Amino acid sequence: PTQAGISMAPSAQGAMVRIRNPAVSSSRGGITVLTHSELSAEIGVTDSIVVSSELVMPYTVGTWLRGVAANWSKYSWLSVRYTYIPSCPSSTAGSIHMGFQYDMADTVPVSVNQLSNLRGYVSGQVWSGSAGLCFINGTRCSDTSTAISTTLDVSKLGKKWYPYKTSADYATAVGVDVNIATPLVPARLVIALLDGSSSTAVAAGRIYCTYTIQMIEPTASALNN
Amino acid sequence: GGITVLTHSELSAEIGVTDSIVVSSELVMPYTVGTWLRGVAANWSKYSWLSVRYTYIPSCPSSTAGSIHMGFQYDMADTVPVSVNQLSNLRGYVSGQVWSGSAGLCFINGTRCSDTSTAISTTLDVSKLGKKWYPYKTSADYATAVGVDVNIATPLVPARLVIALLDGSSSTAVAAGRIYCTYTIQMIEPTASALNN
Amino acid sequence: PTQAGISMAPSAQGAMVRIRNPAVSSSRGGITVLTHSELSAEIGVTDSIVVSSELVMPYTVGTWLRGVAANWSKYSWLSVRYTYIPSCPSSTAGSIHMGFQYDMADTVPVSVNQLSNLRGYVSGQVWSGSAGLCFINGTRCSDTSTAISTTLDVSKLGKKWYPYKTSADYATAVGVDVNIATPLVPARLVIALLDGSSSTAVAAGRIYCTYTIQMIEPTASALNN
Amino acid sequence: GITVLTHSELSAEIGVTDSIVVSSELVMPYTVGTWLRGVAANWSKYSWLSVRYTYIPSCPSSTAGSIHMGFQYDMADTVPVSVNQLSNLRGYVSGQVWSGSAGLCFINGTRCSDTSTAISTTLDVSKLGKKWYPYKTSADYATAVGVDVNIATPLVPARLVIALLDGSSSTAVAAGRIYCTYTIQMIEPTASALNN
Amino acid sequence: GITVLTHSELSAEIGVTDSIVVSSELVMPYTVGTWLRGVAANWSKYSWLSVRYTYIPSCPSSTAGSIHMGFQYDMADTVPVSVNQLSNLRGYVSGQVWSGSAGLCFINGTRCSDTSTAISTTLDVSKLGKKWYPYKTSADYATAVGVDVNIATPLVPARLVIALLDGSSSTAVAAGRIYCTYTIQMIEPTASALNN
Amino acid sequence: GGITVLTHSELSAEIGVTDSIVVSSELVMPYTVGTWLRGVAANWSKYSWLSVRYTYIPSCPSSTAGSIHMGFQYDMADTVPVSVNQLSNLRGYVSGQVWSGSAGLCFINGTRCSDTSTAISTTLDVSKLGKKWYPYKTSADYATAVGVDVNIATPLVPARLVIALLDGSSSTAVAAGRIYCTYTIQMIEPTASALNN
Ligand SMILES: [Ca+2]
Ligand SMILES: [Ca+2]
Ligand SMILES: [Ca+2]
Ligand SMILES: [Ca+2]
Ligand SMILES: [Ca+2]
Ligand SMILES: [Ca+2]
């Protein structure tokens, strides 16, 4: 790209991911802060729509965060980002869509339409979004206008401090009545994939999560449920 | 001073390209790095890594779907990552599209490097390894010993490279690339090749 | 490419080759120096591996050099470079490999593996290496990190001055015993091509050689064998 | 909190035959010799600072035979079986069964000028597995190596291999002896009776 | 892009008789010894930096016989046939079959003071044909020399000639061994299996 | 330092004088330069030219018609000049009347030289020769080897002196002059004379 109004579509986009070392620091007063990134999910696209969802709480966000945050009783999200990176050609048919819900009791969207309304909605070609790399690697950012990544509006959730919950116990509780979840988890990410060319799933991309959390009030890892 | 220092870069592993995730792993000891080194390093009883770097180099069309992943494990007794997720936690995680990394080439022919930010290559942190000098082991004998108990391996091999090759447009393999290893090693205390186990 | 870690694969690479006039100069003391470039070989790729080799001596290096250097008895390589240029799409399957051997008696490699060990090994996608153009045209060079080109380590060959040999006579001599070649030619380039999609060869690229030679001790062109 | 001592003692008695006979000694305090075996046991760990095996004759200038010595470090490696193989090891050394009387100087450190003939080799303390090794007993070691040899590398730094051939008989003949001259650092005391 | 190593290994075993017996060894990596033969093969060319052949006894002070050694460089020259001729070569050296136990010091480089008796000779690396020679195999060499000897000078720098006489029998008697102590520079790697 | 340096000037070749062009050639190795050197240089395995110079000296009347020519060839495999024309192309070409060159004498007796522009003498450029140290060879053995293939000679002899003696007033020979060689050589690695081939 040289002038203005002109754009060039490549045969394929390339993003070399390199995750740096976790950042931990015991800030006086009790809070221990941790900022880090992890591969959150594997993406595949079909010709018919498919809606997936993930709870945004420590145990489910990332595999490392799970084991680490378990040593503390409560926590508070400070920043949560779900960045999408493509691993296919510009010749691949398909689009992705993401957004948030906050009342686990609400129904999970069933149309790209309903989804376009949610908080922090994002949509893009299955083969793009390589621009959002700067978020995961933690480098200086350029033109992120073409990136597929969304964030949680931490500033307006039920409460500030939630309890560290384990998938197991969470499920056991939700089993009684879903509404018991509202005081356990802040929100959930919704993900839709359609506009593909095959009836059998195809390699689309992958989603990485980059978060910053505050952990408080220590407890033996084994007692935490 | 008894030490024989050699620096070389040979082919370490070929990469096939599927859609379902197959996760493999190679030990980071001379016998396995590559065939050329396997042959020379055997003439010496022990060795010490000074610098190990695995680089992925493509050999496919831009129309090839897929991504490759690399990382390290250090307690040979830990479980090999079962999901690429867990793999993204390991020290030195890196991942790119199977057709990229063209720039990494400068690590293999040892020429002047420019911008290596696009290269799919990761390095071993020799500074924080168990020992300095390790014994030269054959896969055969290693296996026999790990059969008794894996922990017996901890003082035989420094690390392990975990590789994953998920994503693909076909349910069968397609030659995608090769992982070359560029190392600098110190070999000590000679021995007849035939006796080294 | 704008930020860092991001790369874009084109539908095809383009390199416009323009060879400049030969550079000759009679430097006092007897040596006559010549620097020039020539198209050295045509490249094609299959699905099974194919190993090719070329002796690196005046008569075989280039078609012009052959006739020119013939007017001098001996010579000495100062710089020899084999640059690869692609003439196909990013959609073409295939890779190339190059390296050197020095004892014509040694066996010619049979696997990409064995070849990865040779001196000055190089490997790359059949559709790339357009970056090495700056070498052939003789322009200012940019980022040659993506180029497919290798050089002879002239600084460590059998001897400095070799005799101008003709393919014919060379062959006649090698026919007796290959080892008689070691004092006639310094080394040979090996070239491998595999990872292709057809059983029938496909247009891959072409290799250009750019050399600088010292020619000494004149002789009538007809007496030179 | 360290205790360093330097000393030399008899390590093993040698005899020569008509056929190659390969033997080996561990380079750990317990097997070097009687004296050290007993003292080193009062400490938990140790570190070699200088190890040297010197061979010294006891036969006539007329006795036929040769001796060979070298070091190995991966206890799992196969022990040599030919003079040729043994010559490839580090610190190789060979000589006539009646030669090497010059190595004596090393045993009572003095003014050693002419040590050209000395049949004596030294251990490279600098490039051993680790610095501090645990004190082990012949008994306990053997038991662990019975399970798998590789369990040994964290227990012993190396072993000295020896070969004797070119003899004049087929039944042993007094040749000489191998003495060891060491300097070791011992730490973390313990009742000698609890050391295994 | 070079790789340098220094080492010593067994080169050949010696036996003495009642009549002169002349033998010879090429001074190329493949024939020096087993170890080097196997390592040097992973590189295309090499360059000698220091070559030394040391003889070491294994018999009694009572064994009769003498040994001789020298160098030759034009592989086509006729190999000596008398102690006299062999004494004219460069680096000549002679001594009693049971002598030379002092040369040992050279094999495990140390404090060598008294090397007067040492039966050991050195190669003049500085004045060889060329600097970088190609790695050749016993097999391939022989084939080329079968055509004409002169095809050899671009393949090997020189050869060590040896003679043994003044013996007490007419049937071989264990005398000693000849070890080689080298320092070599190897370059331009190659799969060991492609080297001829 | 092992080297034995000798500098001498002896007779190298006699020149007959005809009218039809006879072109000859001598190798530039000790065994052929001259008989005296042939004898001494044989006691040493190898050697190295430091300075070789062939000079023509007359022995005829001014009434003698004719011209002599000299030059060098370096790839023993090239064809020996067939016409004096081609010969005038070779490195170090020189040519004068068979009765001149009286002044070249100063190269043979090694006295102080004055104006040597009239001397029929040419030199070998040792600086750009294949090797530094060559093997001492006998014409006999050389011939045997060149019989298999000339290229086997390239690592045995540095050059070759090509001489032509055309022009003459008679169809039969007439003693005209001699070509003397003035050399400085380094002989190394002794050997018994009888074994040197
Ligand atoms: Ca809890
Ligand atoms: Ca071993
Ligand atoms: Ca020629
Ligand atoms: Ca103990
Ligand atoms: Ca070879
Ligand atoms: Ca000769």
What are the SSEs and their pairings?
The structure is cut from a larger assembly and holds six copies of chain A.
Chain A (H helix, E strand, L loop, with lengths): L11 E4 L7 E4 L5 E14 L4 E6 L2 H4 L1 H7 L2 E15 L8 E7 L10 H6 L1 E7 L7 H5 L11 E3 L10 E2 L3 H10 L11 E7 L7 E17 L7
Antiparallel strand pairs in A: 2-3, 3-11, 4-10, 5-8, 5-9, 5-11, 6-7, 6-10
Bound molecules: calcium ion (6 copies).
Short description:
Chains B, F: Disulfide bonds join 106-113. The structure is cut from a larger assembly and holds 6 copies of chain A. With 225 residues, chain A is mostly beta strands.
CATH class descriptor of chain A:
Mainly Beta
Number of domains of chain A: 1
The appropriate CATH architecture of chain A is Sandwich
- Largest interface, by Cβ-Cβ below 8 angstroms: which chains and how many residues each? B-C, 30 and 33 residues
CATH topology of chain A: Jelly Rolls
Number of strands of chain A: 11
- Which ligands appear in the coordinates? calcium ion
User: What string, H for helix and E for strand, traces the elements of chain A in order?
Assistant: EEEEHHEEHEHEEHEE
Beta-strand share of residues of chain A: 35-45%
Sheet of most strands of chain A: 6 strands, antiparallel
Oligomerization status of the protein chains: part of a larger assembly
Q: Termini of chain A, distance in Å?
A: 53 Å
Which class do the helix and strand fractions of chain A yield?
mainly beta
Counted by DSSP, the helix tally of chain A is 5
Main location (chains D, E): virion
Keywords (chains D, E): Calcium, Capsid protein, Metal-binding, T=3 icosahedral capsid protein, Virion
Disulfide bonds (chains D, E): 105-112
GO molecular function (chains D, E): metal ion binding; structural molecule activity
